[PDB]
Amino acid sequence: GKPLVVTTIGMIADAVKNIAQGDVHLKGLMGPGVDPHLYTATAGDVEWLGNADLILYNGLHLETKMGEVFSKLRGSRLVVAVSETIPVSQRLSLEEAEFDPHVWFDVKLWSYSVKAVYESLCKLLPGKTREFTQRYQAYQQQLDKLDAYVRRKAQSLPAERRVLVTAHDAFGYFSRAYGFEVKGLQGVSTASEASAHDMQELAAFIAQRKLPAIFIESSIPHKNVEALRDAVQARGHVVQIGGELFSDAMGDAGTSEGTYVGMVTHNIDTIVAALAR
């Protein structure tokens, strides 16, 4: 029979789909709209995890509530935190007390994670190494093209206009790779809401910098960024909500936004369209 691969975030499931295709059974625990920072594994999830031959998760403490679940499963199956293969020097350190887990927004950096998915699959099914390698090389070429595309789109926007404010601070790697100044209403983790103070400071930032738009996300209730937009207006500045971005989760299955390449493409197109003119 075919082995079972269980993944957390959809971005990782996307890599498994492209590299392993039908050679493995794939179960993604977190679908569209799911916040990985706040996610608690259900009993059904733990069942799937307990039957998996390979478990792939992000690491870098993204899945803040699943550490123990993963801990207890090592020793009986391959468990790989794909993003922990990214060199420490390339990770963004938060006040020397945590690493930013949103590595998928620097496409070149994400190639390390994709390589880990590919290599883990080869360990799982060594007999499939050749086809996995062909599919992986094709997928990596798509990612190379995606990186170049995002960079062109970013460069098409005036430097002064490259200021991105979103529902939470998920674009730190995007900021470094593509030349954007970024701020989020909630922090790198969504574990805590933004305080009244945090909101006034960001509202002041938005008003003083005279930004054209701010963005909502598919995994955080729109209510908060909408309340933020209101605070900005009470400060004499009119900012609009430029669109909804995919931060921690991808779009629906069947749509291009339900793929890693489509998710990123949607984000850059949406951002550039709202920030331009």
Binding site per annotation, positions for Zn(2+): 37, 102, 168, 248
- What Rg value do the Cα atoms of the chain yield, rounded? 19
Minimum Å gap between C-beta 170 and Zn ion is: 4
What stretches of 35-154 adopt beta strand conformation (E)? Answer: 54-57, 78-81
Compare residues 63 and 248 and give the one whose CB is closer to Zn ion: 248
Does the protein bind Zn ion through residue 169 (CB under 5 A)?
no
Does the protein bind Zn ion through residue 103 (CB under 5 A)?
no
Does the protein bind Zn ion through residue 106 (CB under 5 A)?
no
Helical packing angle, 107-124 and 10-20, nearest 10°: 60
Does the protein bind Zn ion through residue 100 (CB under 5 A)?
no
Minimum Å gap between C-beta 176 and Zn ion is: 16
Q: Which residues are annotated as part of the binding site?
A: 37, 102, 168, 248
Tokens 């709209």, residue located: 33
| Position among 45, 244, 248, 257 found at the interface with Zn ion (CB under 5 A) | 248
- In three-state secondary structure terms, 277 is coil
- In three-state secondary structure terms, 19 is helix
Task: Tell me the two tokens of residue 95.
Answer: 């006040």
Compare residues 54 and 66 and give the one whose CB is closer to Zn ion: 66
Could you give the angle at the alpha carbon of 94 between the alpha carbons of 88 and 97, nearest 5°? 85
Minimum Å gap between C-beta 34 and Zn ion is: 11
CA distances from 19 to 31, 128, 137, 217 (A): 19, 10, 9, 28
Minimum Å gap between C-beta 37 and Zn ion is: 6
Secondary structure of 59-81 in HEC code, one letter for each residue: CCCCCCCCHHHHHHHCCCCEEEE
Closest residue to Zn ion using C-beta atoms = 248
Contact 201, 207 (CB under 8 A): no
Q: Which of residues 131-160 bind Zn ion (CB under 5 A)?
A: none
Compare residues 125 and 170 and give the one whose CB is closer to Zn ion: 170
Which range, of 42-50, 132-140, 244-252, 257-265, touches Zn ion by CB under 5 A?
Answer: 244-252
Minimum Å gap between C-beta 27 and Zn ion is: 22
Q: Return d(Cα 232, Cα 20) in angstroms, integer.
A: 47
Task: Tell me the two tokens of residue 171.
Answer: 């674009």
Compare residues 14 and 248 and give the one whose CB is closer to Zn ion: 248
Minimum Å gap between C-beta 242 and Zn ion is: 19
Does the protein bind Zn ion through residue 170 (CB under 5 A)?
yes
What does the binding site for Zn ion look like in residue numbers (CB under 5 A)? Answer: 170, 248
